[PDB]
RNA sequence: UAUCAGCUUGUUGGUGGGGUAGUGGCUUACCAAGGCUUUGACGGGUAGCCGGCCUGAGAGGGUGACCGGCCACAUUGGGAC
RNA sequence: UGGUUGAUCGCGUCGGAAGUGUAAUCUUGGGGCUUAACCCUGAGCGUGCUUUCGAUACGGGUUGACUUGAGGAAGGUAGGG
């Protein structure tokens, strides 16, 4: 119920950097496997499916839960892709990643599932915990000196925190100013393509 | 030219050339191009981003394309509707449609200035 | 024999508009005169007139003069009969039809006389959906 | 038709032909192999397709295909019969579920094993 | 004088119809017609039902338009009573 | 006899009762003549909402409460208004009150010791 | 379902009695000849009904598990206490 | 199924009001289970029905006109009917 295999293979297949940089993605222009350099047809399904899989492997969400997110966004009022990206960003592991306390979303999932975090006073070990507005995520007092935590404390200045979060790095406290908007989620997929895909 | 009231069709239409009937309806923003392959390609090239298109009649690609084409040609832009009726857009056309046109135009203004 | 004089009016108007005739004429009835009046007030025809019989000397004649814009352009994009004699259509104040996404007008006969949908909705009154002229 | 015609006599749908009557509303049915043999396919095509006349527990006797390279079932072998048509075989509308009851999984399978009842090999 | 909750309110069912059988004693079969939409095609149909009323004195004849009021079961099939005759077509 | 009793609802190991009015013969979780209140005992200082006017009407018309409903009416004070008895009538204590906006505004500004204990944990990694 | 067209004689109505918690051919005596039906009676087939469930843009189509309401039944048939 | 029109009824039709449409489900707003499923709670829905008060354009009922549809009279008239 969690993808544990290599991520560079998925990034190469999907054609975009799922996470990180300056890595084995120097072989980017071609998917993994023996048949990587051949010319591709890329149907509309192919395109749509690529966008959906890009979002899925970026956020570490499997198909059933991603589908559930899709119906929630579709029911919600407003743009379906905007709401879907808003939900995926409101996931707690992504919140930790965006605040910059984790090197990657996989590391954020690791620490969240291991329970190194407090949500507004209550301990949460659910990576899919949907953080609500005005929430206060806190690092567990016992685990305020994790090696990944201190690496993040050394590196966060380079990292860019989105406008909808406030982070007290050394304190391990992520204040949620508001639930993010499409202009605030970084554009790296085609949510419109995903929405069109979930209609066929 | 195709009249778009803010990234979507102005009003529902039904076009038909030979035997290729294509139905088009406007959709709320974010709905996407819910259309079959040929009609969807026609709409995506025309620039419509929120539309519901159904293909009635024959499924031949050429005829379906012509039906989508004359369905779009049947579109009647609100200002020219007002000219037709000898009235004003505020007197003939829905306030929600006109408003959505203003927000589309202004968001367009934002994008242009940002360039 | 004649069954729906309202449908006869609508088809006469449609055929004349298609053939680019400037005027069309028909036997007069009160409901036909009302529909012609609201068509004129909504701008789908140039004008209308009820004439006392002088050729057949039998009954009043309703005559509609149509309008074509610059470069001979139709002012009527179509007209359709809804409440047929075979099957009659009645709409409530909440389920009032929308024509051409609101650009066209449905003609509804309400208890307060002939009223275009927009009007009816404002008065929260329904009735018989006569036509969908757009 | 006119509205009055529709009122007097309404629309009637089609019959919606059934495909596997012998199963009698069951996903698969148990049967006994009353005959095991081979049949030539229709044309085009050419082979020795392995089939069996089976008396299913519904009391109906039908011809069932035996998929996979390999075959052990014989006279009076208890089998499970599921739906499934063999296109180049007139009169065959059922297949025998490998790996269930007397019939056993295809010997040298390593791909699509579950469809032929082959247990995973260490 | 001071009777109990008067009015009784509780009013009974009333039907206007046409007499189609008067040839049994103290009984008239009334045909009552109602107009309803067709459930699927929306046309306004005409639904007709035969109601047996109780006509004391046999005051109504064939083709008479009558008014009946529902009552308690007066026989195996009679459940209505004649209250007036509206048109005596004769 | 007409009873005022509890109709069980909710999950396994999480009961929420509806104080309802129905006759004795009816099954426990069935159609009720009227729903009067609710009773959540799983929650802190159990929630007890009872419609005073309706419960007074049903007591005065002769509905017989179950012992549980008698306890709830004692706590709501209805069992004293009807069948006047000297009982404490301990109207439910509230199950306290949290808040979110005030805490967020308190911490947004908290700043100071937020990043301050934060550089103290910097000294901690030093100690780490 | 018309490749089922006639069905019914306590049957339809009336009066008196009886009976019942109660109206009533519910029952009885007498009198009358009605009652239902091509807008489908009678017969055959299938079926517990519904709140709902699934699907569907909707209209509809399929369905009647859990849960809830009504009904029917308790080895088969009948009967009362 | 219904040409033109006067009057009237207010059955269809339309608009209010009251009653009803249990609960659960369902839609939606809040709340609780570490999240979710799930659960609680407010509202909507419950597409109808009954009662009642209005409106009268249209459909229909009742009733009276009109002649243009339809039929008839008189005269004219063609034809392997
Ligand atoms: Mg065609
Ligand atoms: Mg008697
Ligand atoms: Mg059965
Ligand atoms: Mg059913
Ligand atoms: Mg049950
Ligand atoms: Mg008429
Ligand atoms: Mg009139
Ligand atoms: Mg609820
Ligand atoms: Mg919660
Ligand atoms: Mg309900
Ligand atoms: Mg009339
Ligand atoms: Mg002659």
Assess contact for B22 and B55: CB atoms under 8 A.
Answer: yes
Cis peptide before D44 (omega within 30 of 0): yes
- Orientation of helix B61-73 relative to helix B37-46, angle to 10°: 40
Distance CA E37, CA E43 (A): 5
Distance CA B23, CA B16 (A): 9
Residue with tokens 């439910």: F92
Distance CA B74, CA C33 (A): 30
- Return the DSSP state at B8: B
Q: What string of DSSP letters covers chain A?
A: ----S-HHHHHHHHTS-SS-SSSGGGGTTS-SSSS-SS-----HHHHHHHHHHHHHHHHT--HHHHHHHHHHHHHSSS-HHHHHHHHHHHBHHHHHHHHTSSSSHHHHHHHHHHT-EEETTEE---TT-BPPTT-EEEE-STTTT-HHHHHHHHHTTTSPPPTTEEE-GGG-EEEE-S---TTTS---S-HHHHHHHTT-
C80 Cβ contact partners less than 8 Å away, ≥ 6 residues apart: C10, C131, C132, C133
A95 Cβ contact partners less than 8 Å away, ≥ 6 residues apart: A89, A131, A137, A165, A174, A176
Give how far the C-alpha of residue D65 lies from the chain's centroid of Cα atoms, to the nearest Å.
6
CB–CB of B32 and A78 under 8 A?
no
Structure tokens at F98: 């949290």
Please give the residue of chain A at the shortest CA–CA distance from B49.
Answer: A192
The alpha carbon of C100 and the centre of ligand 1 are apart by a number of angstroms equal to 22
Backbone angles phi, psi at E30, to 5 degrees: -110, 135
Distance CA F102, CA C132 (A): 57
Cα distances from A17 to residues A41, A55, E53, in angstroms, run: 21, 11, 87
The secondary element (H helix, E strand) that includes residue F15 is strand F14-23
Backbone angles phi, psi at F36, to 5 degrees: -105, -40
What's the number of CA atoms in the CB half-sphere (13 Å) around residue F88? 6
Distance CA A24, CA A12 (A): 9
| H-assigned helices in F15-112 | 52-61, 67-76, 78-81, 101-110
Look up the domain containing E70 and give its range. Answer: 1-90
Residue of B30, B34, B49 lying closest to A82 (CB–CB): B30
Assess contact for A115 and A102: CB atoms under 8 A.
Answer: no
Distance CA D35, CA A159 (A): 74
In angstroms, the CA of F97 and the C1' of H20 are apart by 41
Assess contact for D31 and D54: CB atoms under 8 A.
Answer: yes
Residue of A78, A82, A192 lying closest to B32 (CB–CB): A192
Residue with tokens 């296109």: D87
Closest CA to B97 of B2, B1, B4: B4
Tell me if residue E86 falls in helix, strand or coil. Answer: strand
Domain count, chain E: 1
Assess contact for F74 and F80: CB atoms under 8 A.
Answer: yes
Assess contact for F38 and F47: CB atoms under 8 A.
Answer: yes
Going across the sheet that includes F64-65, the strands are F47-50, F34-40, F14-23, F2-11, F64-65
Distance CA A123, CA A142 (A): 12
Assess contact for E25 and E71: CB atoms under 8 A.
Answer: no
C61 Cβ contact partners less than 8 Å away, ≥ 6 residues apart: C25, C26, C27, C28, C50, C51, C53
Query: For H69, which residue's CA is nearest its C1'?
Result: C1
The secondary structure of D93-104, three-state, reads CEEECCCCCCCC
The CA-based angle C25-C27-C29, given to 5 degrees, is: 120
Tell me if residue D115 falls in helix, strand or coil. Answer: helix
Assess contact for C3 and C29: CB atoms under 8 A.
Answer: no
Beta strands in D41-92 (DSSP E): 49-56, 61-65, 78-83
Tell me if residue E35 falls in helix, strand or coil. Answer: strand
Cα distances from F87 to residues F67, F78, F83, in angstroms, run: 15, 11, 11
Assess whether E88 (CB) lies less than 7 A from strand H. no
Assess contact for D7 and E45: CB atoms under 8 A.
Answer: yes
The secondary element (H helix, E strand) that includes residue B14 is strand B13-15
Distance CA F111, CA A26 (A): 42
Distance CA C92, CA C82 (A): 15
Cα distances from D101 to residues B33, D39, D77, D80, in angstroms, run: 52, 24, 9, 7
Among all strands, which nt has the closest C1' to F30 (CA)?
A: G68
Backbone angles phi, psi at E69, to 5 degrees: -120, 140
Which residues of A are less than 8 Å from F119 in CB distance?
170
Backbone angles phi, psi at B22, to 5 degrees: -130, 125
Going across the sheet that includes C23-27, the strands are C23-27, C61-65, C47-51
Distance CA B50, CA B28 (A): 6
Distance CA C15, CA C22 (A): 12
Tell me if residue F103 falls in helix, strand or coil. Answer: helix
- Return the DSSP state at B65: H
Among all strands, which nt has the closest C1' to C60 (CA)?
A: H4
Distance CA E31, CA E20 (A): 6
Resolution of this PDB entry, in A? Answer: 2.8
Distance CA F9, CA F17 (A): 6
Distance CA D95, CA D89 (A): 12
Distance CA B24, CA B53 (A): 4
Structure tokens at D107: 């010997």
Give how far the C-alpha of residue B15 lies from the chain's centroid of Cα atoms, to the nearest Å.
12
Tell me if residue F113 falls in helix, strand or coil. Answer: helix
Cα distances from E22 to residues E33, E55, E56, E77, E79, in angstroms, run: 18, 9, 12, 15, 16
CB–CB of A80 and B30 under 8 A?
yes
The secondary structure of C42-101, three-state, reads HCCCCEEEEECCCCCCCCCEEEEECCEECCCEECCCCCCECCCCCCCCEECCCCCCCCHH
State the structure-solving technique. Answer: cryo-EM
Assess contact for B50 and B30: CB atoms under 8 A.
Answer: yes
Distance CA A183, CA A166 (A): 17
Q: Any contact of E with F, at least 3 CB pairs below 8 A?
A: no
Assess contact for A15 and A42: CB atoms under 8 A.
Answer: no
Distance CA A120, CA D105 (A): 57
Please give the residue of chain B at the shortest CA–CA distance from C43.
Answer: B85
By DSSP bridging, strand B22-26 and strand B13-15 are: antiparallel
- Give the dihedral of Cα atoms B26, B27, B33, B34; nearest 10 deg: -100
Look up the domain containing C55 and give its range. Answer: 5-74
Assess whether C85 (CB) lies less than 7 A from strand H. yes
What's the number of CA atoms in the CB half-sphere (13 Å) around residue B69? 9
Structure tokens at D120: 């995973």
- For chain F, how long is the longest CA-to-CA vector? 77
What's the number of CA atoms in the CB half-sphere (13 Å) around residue E77? 9
> Measured on CA atoms in the order C17, C86, D9, E39, is the torsion positive or negative?
positive
Long-range contact set of residues B39-48: C-beta below 8 Å, sequence gap at least 24:
B39/B64, B39/B65, B39/B67, B39/B68, B40/A44, B42/B68, B42/B69, B42/B72, B43/B68, B43/B72, B46/B2, B46/B72, B47/B2, B47/B4, B47/B7, B48/B2, B48/B4, B48/B7, B48/B8, B48/B9
The CA-based angle B3-B6-B11, given to 5 degrees, is: 50
CB–CB of E44 and C88 under 8 A?
yes
Structure tokens at C81: 């009969």
Q: What string of DSSP letters covers B78-95?
A: HHHHHHHHTS-HHHHS-H
Closest CA to C93 of C78, C112, C80: C112
Distance CA F18, CA A161 (A): 49
- Give the dihedral of Cα atoms B32, B34, B40, B46; nearest 10 deg: -40
> Measured on CA atoms in the order A93, A98, A103, A104, is the torsion positive or negative?
positive
Distance CA A152, CA F118 (A): 13
Which residues of E are less than 8 Å from D7 in CB distance?
38, 41, 43, 45
E18 Cβ contact partners less than 8 Å away, ≥ 6 residues apart: E30, E31, E33, E63, E64, E65, E66
Distance CA F53, CA F5 (A): 17
CB–CB of C86 and E43 under 8 A?
yes
Assess contact for A181 and A187: CB atoms under 8 A.
Answer: no
Q: Which nucleotides of G are covered by protein (CB under 7 A)?
A: 1, 11-15, 23-26, 32-37, 39, 60, 67-70
CATH code, domain carrying C24? 3.30.1370.30
Assess whether C97 (CB) lies less than 7 A from strand H. no
By DSSP bridging, strand E27-37 and strand E14-24 are: antiparallel
Assess contact for D112 and D99: CB atoms under 8 A.
Answer: no
Distance CA D68, CA A126 (A): 46
By DSSP bridging, strand D78-83 and strand E27-37 are: unpaired
Structure tokens at B41: 């390609």
Q: What string of DSSP letters covers C24-40?
A: EEEE--HHHHHHHHHHH
**Neighbour count for residue A146 (Cβ, 10 Å):** 20
Among all strands, which nt has the closest C1' to E33 (CA)?
A: H11
Beta strands in D4-47 (DSSP E): 28-39
CB–CB of A192 and B37 under 8 A?
no
> A88-182 domain in CATH 3.10.290.10?
yes
D74 Cβ contact partners less than 8 Å away, ≥ 6 residues apart: D33, D36
D102 Cβ contact partners less than 8 Å away, ≥ 6 residues apart: D72, D73, D77, D78, D79
- Return the DSSP state at E40: T
Residue with tokens 């979507």: B8
Assess contact for A90 and A185: CB atoms under 8 A.
Answer: no
Assess contact for C67 and C46: CB atoms under 8 A.
Answer: yes
């Amino acid at each position: 119920a969690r993808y544990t295999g290599p991520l560079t293979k998925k990034s190469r297949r999907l054609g975009t950097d799922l996470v990180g940089n300056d890595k084995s993605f120097e072989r980017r222009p071609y998917p993994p496997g023996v048949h990587g350099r051949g010319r591709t047809k890329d149907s509309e399904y192919s395109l749509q499916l690529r966008e959906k899989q890009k979002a899925r492997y970026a956020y570490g969400v499997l198909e059933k839960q991603f589908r559930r997110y899709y119906e929630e966004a579709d029911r919600a009022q407003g743009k379906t892709g905007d709401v879907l990206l808003q939900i995926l960003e409101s996931r707690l592991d992504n919140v930790v990643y965006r605040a910059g306390l984790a090197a990657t979303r996989r590391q954020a999932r690791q620490m969240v599932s291991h329970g190194h975090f407090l949500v507004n006073g209550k301990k949460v070990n659910i990576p899919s915990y949907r953080v609500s507005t005005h929430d206060i995520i806190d690092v567990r007092e016992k685990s305020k000196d994790l090696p990944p935590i201190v690496i993040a404390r050394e590196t966060f200045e380079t990292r860019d925190v989105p406008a909808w979060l406030e982070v007290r790095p050394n304190k391990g406290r992520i204040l949620v100013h508001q639930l993010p908007t499409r202009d605030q989620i970084v554009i790296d997929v085609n949510e419109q393509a995903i929405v069109e895909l979930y209609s066929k | 030219k195709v009249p778009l009231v803010g990234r979507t069709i102005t009003h529902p239409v039904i076009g038909e050339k030979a035997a290729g009937v294509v139905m088009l309806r406007p959709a709320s923003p974010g709905t996407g191009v819910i259309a079959g392959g040929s009609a969807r390609a026609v709409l995506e090239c025309a620039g419509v981003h929120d539309v519901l298109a159904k293909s009635l009649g024959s499924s031949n690609a050429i005829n379906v394309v012509h039906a989508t084409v004359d369905a779009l040609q049947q579109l009647e832009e609100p200002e020219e509707v007002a000219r037709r009726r000898g009235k004003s857009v505020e007197d003939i056309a829905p306030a929600a449609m006109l408003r959505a046109r203003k927000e589309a135009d202004e968001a367009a203004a934002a994008a242009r200035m940002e360039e | 024999t004649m069954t729906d004089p309202i449908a006869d009016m609508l088809t006469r108007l449609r055929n004349a508009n298609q053939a680019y005739h400037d005027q069309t004429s028909m036997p007069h009835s009160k409901i036909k005169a009302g529909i012609a009046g609201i068509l004129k007030s909504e701008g789908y025809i140039a004008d209308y007139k009820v004439n006392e019989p002088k050729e057949g000397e039998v009954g009043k004649t309703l005559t509609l003069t149509l309008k074509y814009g610059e470069n001979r352009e139709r002012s009527i994009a179509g007209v359709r009969r809804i409440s047929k004699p075979g099957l009659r259509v009645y709409a409530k104040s909440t389920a009032l039809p929308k024509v051409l996404g609101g650009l066209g007008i449905a003609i509804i006969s309400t208890s307060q006389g002939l009223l275009t949908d927009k009007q009816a909705h404002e008065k929260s009154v329904g009735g018989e959906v006569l036509a969908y002229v757009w | 038709p006119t509205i009055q015609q529709l009122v007097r006599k309404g629309r009637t749908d089609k019959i919606s032909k059934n495909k596997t009557p012998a199963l009698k509303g069951s996903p698969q049915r148990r049967g006994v192999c009353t005959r095991v043999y081979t049949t030539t396919p229709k044309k085009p095509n050419s082979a020795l397709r392995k089939v069996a006349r089976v008396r299913l527990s519904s009391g109906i006797e039908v011809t069932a295909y035996i998929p996979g390279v390999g075959h052990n079932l014989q006279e009076h072998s208890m089998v499970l019969v599921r739906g499934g048509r063999v296109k180049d075989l007139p009169g065959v509308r059922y297949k025998i579920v490998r790996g269930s009851l007397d019939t056993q999984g295809v010997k040298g399978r390593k791909q699509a094993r579950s469809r032929y009842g082959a247990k995973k090999e260490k | 004088m001071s009777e109990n909750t008067a009015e009784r309110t509780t009013r009974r069912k009333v039907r206007e119809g046409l007499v189609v059988s008067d040839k049994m004693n103290k009984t008239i079969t009334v045909m009552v017609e109602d107009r309803v939409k067709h459930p699927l095609y929306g046309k306004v149909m005409t639904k007709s039902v035969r109601l047996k009323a109780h006509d004391e004195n046999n005051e109504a004849g064939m083709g008479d338009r009558v008014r009946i009021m529902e009552t308690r079961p007066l026989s195996a099939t009679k459940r209505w009573r004649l209250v007036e005759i509206i048109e005596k077509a004769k | 006899a007409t009873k005022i009793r509890l109709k069980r609802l909710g999950k396994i190991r999480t009961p929420h009762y509806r104080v309802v009015v129905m006759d004795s013969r009816a099954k426990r979780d069935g159609r009720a003549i009227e729903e009067i209140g609710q009773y959540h005992p799983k929650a802190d200082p159990s929630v007890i909402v009872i419609d005073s006017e309706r419960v007074q009407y049903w007591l005065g018309v002769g509905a017989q409460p179950t012992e549980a409903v008698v306890a709830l009416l004692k706590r709501t004070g209805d069992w004293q208004k009807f069948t006047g008895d000297t009982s404490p009538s301990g109207v439910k204590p509230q199950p306290e009150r949290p808040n979110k906006d005030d805490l967020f505004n308190a911490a947004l500004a908290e700043a100071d010791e937020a990043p301050r204990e934060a550089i103290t944990k910097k000294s901690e990694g030093a100690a780490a």
